[PDB]
Amino acid sequence: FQPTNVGYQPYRVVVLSFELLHAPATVCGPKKSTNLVKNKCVNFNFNG
Amino acid sequence: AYTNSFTRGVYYPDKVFRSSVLHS
């Protein structure tokens, strides 16, 4: 690595690996929760 | 020394509820 090098320039990398296990969830997107409703038909999203 | 395990030492393979079923 020298700044004059493009395929020979330094690149920083971050790889995000996501676990979609059957377990309780742990890291969420910013989507805001709302109150539960029962016996009425609903569109739903639990943990994604 | 040794002993027969019989049919002990089964465990839940994943955190999913399943009931009244023969699941592979």
Cβ contact, residue pair A21, B16, below 8 Å: no
Q: Single out the residue of A42, A27, A26 nearest to residue B15, CA to CA.
A: A26
Both tokens of residue B15? 């955190």
What does the DSSP assignment read for A13-42? Answer: ---------SSPP----SPPP-----SS--
Interface check for B14 against chain A (CB to CB < 8 A): the answer is yes
**CB-CB neighbors (< 8 A) of A23 in chain B:** 15
Phi and psi torsions of A21, nearest 5°: -70, 170
Q: Residues with Cβ < 8 Å from B14, sequence gap 6 or more?
A: A22
Distance CA A27, CA A12 (A): 24
CA B8 and chain centroid, separation: 8
- Do the Cβ atoms of A24 and B14 come closer than 8 Å? no
- Do the Cβ atoms of A9 and A1 come closer than 8 Å? yes
CA-angle at B14, arms to B11 and B18, nearest 5°: 90
